[PDB]
Amino acid sequence: NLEPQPTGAVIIHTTQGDLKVELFAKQTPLTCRNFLQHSLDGYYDGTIFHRLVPGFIIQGGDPTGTGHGGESIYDGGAFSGDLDPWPMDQRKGHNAGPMGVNFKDEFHSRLKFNRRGLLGMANEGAPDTNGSQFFFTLGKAEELNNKNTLFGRVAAGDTIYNLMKWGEAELIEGTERPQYPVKITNIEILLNPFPD
């Protein structure tokens, strides 16, 4: 079996090598928009991969580097007009209204965390609590199926070797924080599948 064709792509440039990433934007449009818009805006520039669970996941995307920060682009009803990407009437619960925060999960039957090199959206451990943080798998992680949106994968080529080396980093004792974290320098958009 094969995943559906990804429709977007970026290169994440870091202090510890490049990672070329394909995005399942057809299947996960809100999640891919959030990631790409933040990328374009420079929101992830200088952010680190602050959390490493060896053999499982490595996580970043937090401008505070704590694991507890970051915001989605949708917060406060941004992009909630009738002709916008996520109209207000589609938002439920705490995602809704002028004080709304976070955005919905986007699960898909052909997107499963079955191997390393898959890009997922981190959340708060409850439904529809996606902000700005994202992670890559470092091994099979099917326990994340129907818990985290899966929105991309490492692209063909040799950059997967960088991800796997990041997964072997030394940790600060008593933490999941690498002693020498990977830092994003910039994100280069190769193919943006969303309309102007």
Short mmCIF file of C-alpha atoms in Angstrom, two decimals:
data_model
loop_
_atom_site.label_atom_id
_atom_site.label_comp_id
_atom_site.label_asym_id
_atom_site.label_seq_id
_atom_site.Cartn_x
_atom_site.Cartn_y
_atom_site.Cartn_z
CA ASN A 1 0.00 0.00 0.00
CA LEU A 2 1.01 3.58 -0.73
CA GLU A 3 0.02 6.89 0.76
CA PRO A 4 -1.81 9.35 -1.47
CA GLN A 5 0.39 11.63 -3.55
CA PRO A 6 1.66 14.57 -1.48
CA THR A 7 0.99 17.95 -3.05
CA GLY A 8 3.37 20.26 -1.15
CA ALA A 9 7.04 20.27 -0.24
CA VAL A 10 9.59 22.18 1.82
CA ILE A 11 13.17 21.92 3.01
CA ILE A 12 13.70 22.53 6.70
CA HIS A 13 17.24 23.95 6.97
CA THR A 14 18.81 23.42 10.40
CA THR A 15 22.08 23.69 12.27
CA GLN A 16 22.35 19.88 12.01
CA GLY A 17 21.45 19.31 8.35
CA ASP A 18 18.53 19.67 5.95
CA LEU A 19 15.28 17.75 6.04
CA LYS A 20 13.25 17.60 2.84
CA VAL A 21 9.54 17.13 3.60
CA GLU A 22 6.51 16.33 1.48
CA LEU A 23 3.06 17.48 2.66
CA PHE A 24 -0.27 15.64 2.32
CA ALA A 25 -2.06 18.92 1.71
CA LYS A 26 -5.04 17.41 -0.12
CA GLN A 27 -5.88 15.28 2.91
CA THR A 28 -4.80 17.67 5.69
CA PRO A 29 -5.41 21.15 4.30
CA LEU A 30 -5.85 23.07 7.55
CA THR A 31 -2.78 21.46 9.06
CA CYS A 32 -0.64 22.03 5.99
CA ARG A 33 -1.82 25.65 5.69
CA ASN A 34 -0.94 26.31 9.33
CA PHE A 35 2.52 24.81 8.88
CA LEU A 36 3.24 26.57 5.58
CA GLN A 37 1.92 29.96 6.68
CA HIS A 38 3.98 29.86 9.87
CA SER A 39 6.99 28.75 7.80
CA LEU A 40 6.54 31.62 5.29
CA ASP A 41 6.13 34.13 8.11
CA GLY A 42 9.41 33.06 9.72
CA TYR A 43 7.55 31.80 12.79
CA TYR A 44 9.71 28.68 13.02
CA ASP A 45 13.02 30.46 12.36
CA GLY A 46 15.35 29.85 15.31
CA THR A 47 13.03 27.30 16.92
CA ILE A 48 14.49 24.04 18.17
CA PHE A 49 13.50 20.41 18.38
CA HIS A 50 12.94 20.59 22.12
CA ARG A 51 11.60 17.10 22.84
CA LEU A 52 13.16 13.76 21.92
CA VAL A 53 11.79 10.34 22.83
CA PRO A 54 14.38 8.00 21.27
CA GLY A 55 12.89 5.52 18.83
CA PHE A 56 9.49 7.26 19.01
CA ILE A 57 9.28 10.99 18.16
CA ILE A 58 11.22 14.24 17.96
CA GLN A 59 9.14 17.41 18.37
CA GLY A 60 9.53 21.11 17.61
CA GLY A 61 7.61 24.13 16.42
CA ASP A 62 7.41 26.03 19.73
CA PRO A 63 8.67 29.64 19.65
CA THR A 64 9.22 29.32 23.43
CA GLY A 65 11.14 26.02 23.17
CA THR A 66 9.34 24.68 26.27
CA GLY A 67 6.85 22.34 24.72
CA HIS A 68 4.03 24.48 26.06
CA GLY A 69 3.95 27.39 23.60
CA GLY A 70 2.96 28.20 20.06
CA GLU A 71 -0.34 29.17 18.45
CA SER A 72 -2.19 28.14 15.30
CA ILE A 73 -2.78 30.68 12.56
CA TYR A 74 -6.55 30.32 13.10
CA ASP A 75 -6.66 31.62 16.67
CA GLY A 76 -9.07 34.45 17.41
CA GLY A 77 -11.18 33.71 14.35
CA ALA A 78 -8.40 34.57 11.91
CA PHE A 79 -9.17 33.20 8.44
CA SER A 80 -12.80 32.55 9.40
CA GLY A 81 -14.61 34.53 6.71
CA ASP A 82 -17.12 32.90 4.38
CA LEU A 83 -14.54 32.47 1.60
CA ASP A 84 -11.59 31.81 3.90
CA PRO A 85 -9.86 28.47 4.64
CA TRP A 86 -11.86 27.61 7.79
CA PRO A 87 -15.16 29.52 8.03
CA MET A 88 -16.34 30.29 11.54
CA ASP A 89 -19.40 28.02 11.29
CA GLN A 90 -17.09 25.02 10.86
CA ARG A 91 -15.33 25.67 14.19
CA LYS A 92 -16.60 23.96 17.32
CA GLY A 93 -16.14 24.39 21.02
CA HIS A 94 -13.00 26.15 22.13
CA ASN A 95 -11.83 26.46 18.51
CA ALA A 96 -14.77 28.83 17.81
CA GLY A 97 -15.41 32.55 18.20
CA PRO A 98 -13.22 35.66 18.55
CA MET A 99 -11.40 34.01 21.47
CA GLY A 100 -11.10 30.64 19.75
CA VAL A 101 -7.83 28.75 20.01
CA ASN A 102 -6.38 25.77 18.12
CA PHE A 103 -7.78 23.86 15.16
CA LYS A 104 -9.26 20.50 14.35
CA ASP A 105 -7.68 17.12 13.79
CA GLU A 106 -7.54 15.86 10.19
CA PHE A 107 -7.25 12.08 10.29
CA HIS A 108 -7.26 9.98 7.10
CA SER A 109 -7.68 6.28 6.37
CA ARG A 110 -4.49 6.07 4.25
CA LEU A 111 -2.29 8.07 6.62
CA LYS A 112 -0.94 5.92 9.46
CA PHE A 113 2.13 6.27 11.69
CA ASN A 114 3.62 2.99 10.50
CA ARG A 115 7.30 3.90 10.22
CA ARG A 116 9.90 6.55 10.92
CA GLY A 117 10.07 9.78 8.97
CA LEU A 118 6.39 10.71 9.23
CA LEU A 119 5.35 14.25 10.11
CA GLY A 120 2.55 14.65 12.65
CA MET A 121 0.87 17.55 14.36
CA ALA A 122 1.44 17.68 18.11
CA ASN A 123 -1.50 18.53 20.32
CA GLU A 124 -2.52 18.86 23.97
CA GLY A 125 -3.66 15.26 24.36
CA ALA A 126 -7.33 15.96 23.57
CA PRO A 127 -9.23 16.32 20.28
CA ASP A 128 -8.92 19.49 18.21
CA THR A 129 -6.05 21.03 20.21
CA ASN A 130 -3.55 21.62 17.40
CA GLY A 131 -1.38 24.74 17.74
CA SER A 132 2.01 25.18 16.07
CA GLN A 133 4.04 22.20 17.30
CA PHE A 134 4.87 19.25 15.06
CA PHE A 135 6.93 16.07 15.28
CA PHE A 136 8.64 13.42 13.21
CA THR A 137 8.43 9.73 13.98
CA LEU A 138 11.65 7.84 14.67
CA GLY A 139 10.01 4.42 14.40
CA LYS A 140 6.63 2.76 14.07
CA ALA A 141 4.13 4.64 16.27
CA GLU A 142 0.66 3.35 15.49
CA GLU A 143 -0.55 4.34 18.97
CA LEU A 144 -0.69 7.86 17.47
CA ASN A 145 -3.23 6.80 14.84
CA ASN A 146 -6.49 8.71 15.38
CA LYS A 147 -4.72 10.80 18.03
CA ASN A 148 -2.44 13.02 15.94
CA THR A 149 -2.93 14.39 12.45
CA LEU A 150 -0.39 12.92 10.03
CA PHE A 151 0.37 15.68 7.52
CA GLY A 152 3.66 14.86 5.83
CA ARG A 153 6.67 12.64 5.37
CA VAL A 154 10.39 12.95 4.76
CA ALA A 155 10.92 13.07 0.97
CA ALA A 156 12.95 10.58 -1.01
CA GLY A 157 16.68 11.23 -0.89
CA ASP A 158 19.35 11.28 1.79
CA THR A 159 17.87 13.75 4.27
CA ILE A 160 16.18 10.95 6.25
CA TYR A 161 19.69 10.22 7.60
CA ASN A 162 19.70 13.62 9.30
CA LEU A 163 16.41 12.94 11.07
CA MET A 164 17.71 9.62 12.32
CA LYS A 165 20.91 11.18 13.63
CA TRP A 166 18.87 13.83 15.48
CA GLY A 167 17.07 10.90 17.11
CA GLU A 168 20.38 9.65 18.55
CA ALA A 169 21.17 12.91 20.39
CA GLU A 170 22.31 13.07 23.99
CA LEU A 171 19.58 14.12 26.44
CA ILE A 172 19.84 16.42 29.46
CA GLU A 173 19.58 14.12 32.45
CA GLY A 174 16.05 13.85 33.80
CA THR A 175 14.51 15.39 30.67
CA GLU A 176 13.43 14.72 27.09
CA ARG A 177 15.44 17.78 26.04
CA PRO A 178 18.52 17.27 23.85
CA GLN A 179 21.75 18.73 25.26
CA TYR A 180 22.53 20.16 21.83
CA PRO A 181 19.18 20.66 20.11
CA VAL A 182 18.64 20.94 16.38
CA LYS A 183 17.76 24.54 15.49
CA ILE A 184 15.78 25.55 12.42
CA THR A 185 17.49 28.33 10.48
CA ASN A 186 14.84 28.74 7.80
CA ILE A 187 12.22 26.79 5.88
CA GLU A 188 12.38 26.88 2.11
CA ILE A 189 9.08 26.26 0.33
CA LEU A 190 9.58 24.14 -2.81
CA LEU A 191 5.92 23.65 -3.71
CA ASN A 192 3.09 25.53 -2.05
CA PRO A 193 -0.12 23.86 -3.07
CA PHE A 194 -2.50 26.48 -1.75
CA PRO A 195 -3.95 29.27 -3.92
CA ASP A 196 -2.92 32.89 -3.59
#
